[PDB]
Design a protein around this ligand. Structure first.
Ligand SMILES: NC[C@]1(C(=O)Nc2cncc3ccccc23)CCOc2ccc(Cl)cc21
Ligand SMILES: NC[C@]1(C(=O)Nc2cncc3ccccc23)CCOc2ccc(Cl)cc21
Lengths: 304, 304
């Protein structure tokens, strides 16, 4: 019993973190095999960030201008290239701690763990989600760039995020491990405002199923609804539309609890319309949307 | 910017987890040097849990009855002893991944990370706190016993908790690494009810300081108070009394924000009396109490 915002064990990722310095700029890099991946803005000064021409700034950089340190030992850079918004620094030594890994580009609503790092050293691990507006609500200070987001399937780490930027609103933007930003964000210190941060409906429903599995059942109502009627309410509350694909994904949670997906939608509809009335669900006074249906099944089943 | 419920990187602890089996009972153990620590209830059947006489049950167990597996390799048990509610299984091999470590007994209100494990394998990491009633609100399923709670000071892991039990209310009880339970709980399947789960006032105040540092300032009021007046309100709301020691501990957060501790107390007093009015603080609709003042300084400063 109990339900926590749980991150994946971070050991496999801690073994990959290195410090990357270019001139007077330092950030984190991810060392997998003989390649260190890091944000390309490691080549920028604070002034360059205002309007950087990365290809031009990179002409002034050679392999020896990128200092890669793993622990307290220096790695030898034998090649470098820019792929979208990341640099790939080829080193002469394969990371002996390289786990089984994949690079994946996640969809909005998908969750992942972040290992926040400073100077190549891990400081903490937390769970977050790719928001529907393609920002993430992380916890990052200056120097955290290059920290990564990931999921683990038994022994394989699927890297899905690399931290690059903080918007003026305190939310975060980054790329997948091929250097493509999530959403419309750019690695330039310019006016970039995020769109509506809508609530991830399928994740709220999954967390309401977790609440029923853990004994919090007060919100279960006597009603049902349809996807169309539910979505009319979801639109009004800035919740993402629920599709039949989301209903299919919630199937196993529906079977475990015996609560039909549309009945849970009707319970969610009443919670949106009536509020919580000072009550809590799994220790929260708001509807939590950063647990996917897969996360709920994993946490409630004990997948290692 | 941003403020997350952040756990310590779990790698150093993942390297210590092993599976311990005694007969048909399996749980997790912690392998440090040449000793594996685990809950003594690994010797019990489901029936024994109702009224176990551990000393008597242990007479029927020899070193070869405790199966310790690290990964997919078996460790040789050369000694065993019971210390309070834990068994210490001496093995012939020192854990090569033993980090620098200490065993500490924490006070209520103190936070720590938990590495939830099943069959000696890590499944997730989350942050929690020792409640004022000496329970913890974890996320544990059957088989999670022996999972540990810890804090990290740079390279030294201070182990503070080992999971043993779930109360009928879904909250958790466990011991320090010397086998002494936190609070009045026992490793027996009997009527054990938790006391009042009061709110950890000093931690709420620390989290209100984190909110001000991160830009959430709406709740800052035009008032101040005294410890005595504040505590009259705290008592009414089942909040722990605030002492001058808590005020001293909040000193650095007071200096960083320029908000006197008693002014923040007055703001907290108004939030308790008026409610949130549908507003949020750091993405929460309730007052968060599982961040200590040290956690806030660490997260807002970037300690690795
Ligand atoms: N140091 C490089 C960089 C960075 O780390 N950004 C940040 C990323 N995340 C959280 C931050 C929290 C406070 C401060 C900066 C943060 C990225 C490139 O553009 C900039 C531009 C300005 C500044 Cl002051 C920093 C940066
Ligand atoms: N298997 C041993 C043990 C255990 O793991 N307990 C649990 C601890 N934490 C979370 C649990 C969530 C569901 C179930 C049990 C949980 C501890 C000893 O006493 C008992 C007694 C009964 C049962 Cl059914 C299990 C146990």
């Amino acid at each position: 019993s109990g339900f926590r915002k749980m991150a994946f064990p971070s050991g496999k990722v801690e073994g990959c973190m290195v410090q990357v310095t270019c001139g007077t700029t330092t950030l984190n890099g991810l060392w997998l095999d003989d390649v260190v991946y890091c944000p390309r803005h490691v080549i920028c000064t604070s002034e360059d960030m205002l309007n950087p021409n990365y290809e031009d700034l990179l002409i002034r950089k050679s392999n020896h201008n990128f200092l890669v340190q793993a622990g307290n030992v220096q790695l030898r850079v034998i090649g470098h290239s820019m792929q979208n918004c990341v640099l790939k620094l080829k080193v002469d030594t394969a990371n002996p701690k390289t786990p089984k890994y994949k690079f994946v580009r996640i969809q909005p609503g998908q969750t992942f763990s972040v290992l926040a790092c400073y100077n190549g050293s891990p400081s903490g691990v937390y769970q977050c989600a790719m928001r529907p507006n393609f920002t993430i609500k992380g916890s990052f200070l200056n120097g955290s760039c290059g920290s990564v987001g990931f999921n683990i399937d038994y022994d394989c780490v699927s890297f899905c995020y690399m931290h690059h930027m903080e918007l003026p609103t305190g939310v975060h933007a980054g790329t997948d491990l091929e250097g493509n930003f999530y959403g419309p964000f750019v690695d330039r210190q310019t006016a970039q405002a995020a769109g509506t941060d809508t609530t991830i409906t399928v994740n709220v429903l999954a967390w309401l199923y977790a609440a029923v599995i853990n004994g919090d059942r007060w919100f279960l109502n006597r009603f049902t609804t349809t996807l169309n009627d539910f979505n009319l309410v979801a639109m009004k509350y800035n919740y993402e539309p629920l599709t039949q694909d989301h209903v299919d994904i919630l199937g196993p949670l529906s079977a475990q609890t015996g609560i039909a997906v549309l009945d849970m939608c009707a319970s969610l509809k009443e919670l949106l319309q009536n509020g919580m009335n000072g009550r809590t669900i799994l220790g929260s006074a708001l509807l939590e949307d950063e647990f996917t249906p897969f996360d709920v099944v994993r946490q409630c089943s004990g997948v290692t």
